[PDB]
Design a protein around this ligand. Structure first.
Ligand SMILES: NC[C@@H]1O[C@H](O[C@H]2[C@@H](O)[C@H](O[C@@H]3[C@@H](O)[C@H](N)C[C@H](N)[C@H]3O[C@H]3O[C@H](CO)[C@@H](O)[C@H](O)[C@H]3N)O[C@@H]2CO)[C@H](N)[C@@H](O)[C@@H]1O
Lengths: 129, 95, 106, 76
RNA sequence: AAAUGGAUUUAAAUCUCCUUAUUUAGAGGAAGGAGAAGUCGUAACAAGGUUUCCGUAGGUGAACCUGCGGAAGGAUCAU
RNA sequence: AUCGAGGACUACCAAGAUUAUAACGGAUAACGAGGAAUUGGGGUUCGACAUCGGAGAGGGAGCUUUACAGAUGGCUACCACUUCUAAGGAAGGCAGCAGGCGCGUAAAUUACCCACUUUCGAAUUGAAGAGGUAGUGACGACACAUAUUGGAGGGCAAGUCUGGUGCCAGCAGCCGCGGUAAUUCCAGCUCCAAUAGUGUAUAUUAAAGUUGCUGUGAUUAAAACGCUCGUAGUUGAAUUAAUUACUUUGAAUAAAAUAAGGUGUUUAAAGCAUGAAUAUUCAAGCAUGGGACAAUGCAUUAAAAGGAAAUUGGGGUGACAGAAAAUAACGGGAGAGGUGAAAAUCCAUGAUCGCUAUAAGAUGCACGAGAGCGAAAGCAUUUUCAACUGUGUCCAUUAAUCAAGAACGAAAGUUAGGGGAUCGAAGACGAUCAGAUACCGUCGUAGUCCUAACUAUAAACGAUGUCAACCAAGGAUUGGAUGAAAACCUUGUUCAGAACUUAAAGAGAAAUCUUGAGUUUAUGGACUUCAGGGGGAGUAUGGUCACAAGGCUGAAACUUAAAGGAAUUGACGGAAGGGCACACCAGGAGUGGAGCCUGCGGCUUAAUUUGACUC
RNA sequence: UUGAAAAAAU
RNA sequence: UGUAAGUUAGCAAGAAAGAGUAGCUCUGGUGAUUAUCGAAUCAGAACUUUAAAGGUUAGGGG
């Protein structure tokens, strides 16, 4: 069954950009799914999205412009200590200036670029090139 | 690996089909794996069809035809020249 | 078995799946101390009993001079390869001969 | 998809976009236990096992909802 | 307060039943492996000259043969 | 009772404690920690031995002194040892420092002194095989005079040097080199790597993405349970403007050591001669800022999650047909079965053949399909359950996968009845063959069929586990719903199902796959099982189930450089298709038969010289 | 219709 | 209280092996009728002795 709603959402976006689609639909829209797209919009990997109200966790339409390379979820969210960031950057990211991790912290959803500044850790949701 | 995509037979959604007996050697072969040919032949061959009409007690008698369905297996289906070995890219022909 | 709380299945799987290698398993079975004539020893001292010559395998030809040596710690019989050319003469009957493995491990 | 048969139907009711027993109906198990007259009906014996587990699945859940007292037990 | 008698405690040592590890058992019996040119056959790889193989049962110096069902990894994707 | 809490022990009372989150038991060549070897991150192996804690003084057992001993360089008894003896007796515990025997591949002097550090004492002094110096010391570490080891075919640096040996000696960790011209052997000359170093054998680590959380594979190389149900376990849709986990900080946290801050032991290995704040603490624990994600149970929905309340269904159970053979009567008088050819066999008691009747056994053609149903096995004559679709119906997370456990599970096989027509393991004849104990022909017990009870294996195959999201183009099919065309036929939209064609795209080692074998070095959706070179071998032993055959679980000793997968070329086929040749058909001449010329083999000889041996 | 075999290594 | 190999799964089995048993004085359990009445049976506790089936009957075992 649907174990991780975020996992099925991200693979839909990754597959859509590999086919050159202009906008894709994700039927469920949790809080983290919308929050994850907000992290990818500050980096300008997507232009904008929308949240159709269907009374059953309505769909999301993501507007993308050939910029997202690989957005993926991470299997059960590992506890990322602040000192452990360097372990994951060197593996999950292509280069020290390109990739962007996504983490969940008590102060809200944050990316690796800003969560280091906020001086906090927590679980990890995924990444995107 | 797989010389054929459908493994020679022609069954997809069923796990068993009743056996039939080959018409030449009498070898138990499945219904779909068998080679089915339908033969229509007049009992009187063309070399003798006009011989009957010269001396026939009837007036407008039309000679009937024999209706037999022959099923062969691969062992004597190929040996009987019913089917032959085809090219690798010519195997997919199904007409 | 990727789940965060499933750290017992993964560990138990590796404990089960580690026994199938031919190399490390030799390091946990009690056979080195039992069936290996050398045991865990580098060298084995023995006594000469018989002089024997083993012919080579199919592609090659010739007779390889060898000696059947009986150990002093286990008493087992092992065939030993006399090292050099014409060196079978140097060895004698009932003398201390050192036996130490071969190139291939064990 | 269905719990037991590998069929995947999606027929549903669609409650419109505006705002302006099940345990009892499964005790099918009684109707099958037809079994006495046809003891060799091995296909009905298998299908009865599926229905028996279906009831033993709502029992385990209804108890945690306190709908049924924890002394509930299904016997024919 | 010394020898010594007796009754308890902790009990060494030993005899009889009760499991783990190491050994003697002859040639003994039944297996397996290795070693250029040793016998008998043609079983397999071409349609290998009876298509091959799987499960099961029987037979037979030997591969193996035959019965029931299955498979194409068949020699047919086909009338 | 003990200094002290307590089943520590005693008397009474109740039956309670652990257990799949691995209880109880078994092995270690197991003293634990600080740490050591090696690491890109992650990890693997070792740790008796510097320091801390634990235990022991040949083996337990019992006690003395004392503040602390179950003390053993204290005592006693027993078991096993050793020493002197006047033959009556006596003491001893080197797992303390040296040293002796044995054990082994394996390990130093039967030296001197309390000077450095420290401890004990009747206390400034006396004692210490603790401690220090000296001695052996190629385990190792640092600076450094000017000499060996192994090799010179590839991995790997180096000889297209000369003598011998002639698949024999031999070298070779691996591939191999040697059967009279050795780049590899035994030797003579030369230089290649390292240098107080260098070969050898064993073990640890990296390579090994060959143990895989980071990080593997499961169609064909090894490997998806035959399928389904199911407990433990793991994983569980969205939504809200009291603990625990998570996360940020601190406190305390043995030294040695890890990386070092400083410091010219001449550098360095060293050493700490200001003592780096030195950071260390994985696992746990204490206090604290935050609650996004999370686990625990006392109020929103209505998930292309699930479950419950007009059709389709060779889905499961129970209660018409003539073929082959037999029997009966009738016609006919000589063959009939069978094979490439025959024979054994049946027939003058009338066979084979033809019409008509009778009874049981079995079967279910044509319709019959890359069509349908079923979890799998499977399901084919007519006259209880599963699924799809329709649905402004109900519940609200009831969900997915699943060790243990259980149901169903082709054919053969077992047991007892009924039946026993056709075919037919064993078997008997007849052929073929060198033999044939087989293929071919004839006969025939078990079986093939039904019932009841077992067995639980198959190429149980799509060699492809189950659930879930995305996924290019096209024809066609089965069952529904909705429109037009007025149950069937043509067409549009849409849901479910078995499949198919193309791909210049994606994957793969390739064949191939596309309703994945795609979304994977740009590696993580959730779960279960299996595999680690080939043999030994699914064998032995052990356990368990079965009336039995057998099934499920199931190694090692030893042996070996390959075994195996997909495609290319060639060759081969008692495989096919297309052509050709005095190859053959229709023939002529012949050779082979006779005498003789000549060549060859053989015999002979002093020599009867030798090359050639199917075209 | 019948039709079996070709000593080990270079 | 405990009881092996083997096995036709029924048996082997009273397998083998070990503990208790006396006398006297007591206590409790097992019922009928509404406190009385009746039965031999089992268990437990003190105290004593010449330490208890053995006068008779009465398996040797592997
Ligand atoms: N390896 C065990 C088994 O050996 C079986 O067969 C074994 C023997 O029967 C077989 O023997 C072969 C023989 O078949 C062949 N026709 C003649 C050959 N000379 C024999 O060879 C055998 O024996 C000779 C005797 O000197 C040895 O020199 C030679 O090394 C050895 N292989 O060789 C095998 C090993 O000795 C089967 N191959 C198989 O079941 C299995 O491999």
């Amino acid at each position: 069954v649907r174990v991780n709603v975020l996992a099925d959402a991200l693979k839909s976006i990754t597959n859509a950009e590999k086919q050159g689609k202009r906008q894709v639909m994700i039927r469920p829209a949790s809080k983290v799914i919308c929050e994850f797209l907000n992290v990818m919009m500050k980096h300008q990997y997507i232009t904008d999205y929308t949240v159709v109200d269907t009374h059953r966790s309505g769909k999301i339409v993501v507007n993308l412009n050939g910029r997202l390379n690989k957005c993926a979820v991470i299997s059960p969210r590992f506890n990322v200590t602040l000192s452990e960031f360097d372990k994951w950057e060197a593996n999950l990211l292509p280069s020290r200036h390109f990739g962007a991790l996504v983490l969940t912290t008590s102060y809200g959803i944050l990316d690796n670029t800003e969560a280091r500044a906020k001086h906090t850790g927590g679980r990890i949701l995924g990444f995107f090139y | 690996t797989s010389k054929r995509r459908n493994n020679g037979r022609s069954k997809k959604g069923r796990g068993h089909t009743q056996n039939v007996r080959c018409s030449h050697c009498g070898r138990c072969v499945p219904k779909d794996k068998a080679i089915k040919r339908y033969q229509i032949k007049n009992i009187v061959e063309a070399a003798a069809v006009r011989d009957i009409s010269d001396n026939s007690a009837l007036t407008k008698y039309k000679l009937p035809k024999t209706y037999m369905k022959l099923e062969y297996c691969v062992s004597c289906g190929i040996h009987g020249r019913v089917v032959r070995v085809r090219s690798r890219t010519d195997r997919r022909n199904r007409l | 078995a990727r789940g965060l709380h499933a750290a017992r299945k993964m560990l138990a799987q590796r404990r089960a799946n580690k026994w199938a290698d031919k190399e490390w398993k030799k390091g946990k079975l009690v056979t080195r101390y039992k069936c290996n004539p050398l045991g865990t020893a580098s060298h084995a001292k023995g006594l000469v009993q018989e002089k024997l010559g083993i012919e080579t395998k199919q592609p090659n030809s010739g007779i390889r001079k060898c000696v059947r040596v009986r150990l002093l710690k286990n008493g087992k019989k092992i065939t030993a390869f006399v090292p050099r050319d014409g060196s079978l003469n140097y060895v004698n009957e009932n003398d201390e001969v050192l036996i130490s493995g071969f190139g291939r491990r064990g | 998809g269905r719990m037991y048969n590998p069929g995947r139907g999606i027929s549903r009711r669609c409650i419109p976009y505006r705002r302006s027993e099940d345990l009892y109906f499964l005790m099918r198990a009684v109707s099958v236990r037809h079994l006495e007259k046809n003891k060799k009906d091995k296909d009905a014996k298998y299908h009865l096992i599926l229905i028996e587990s279906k009831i033993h699945r709502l029992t385990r859940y209804y108890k945690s909802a306190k709908v049924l007292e924890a002394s509930f037990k299904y016997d024919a």
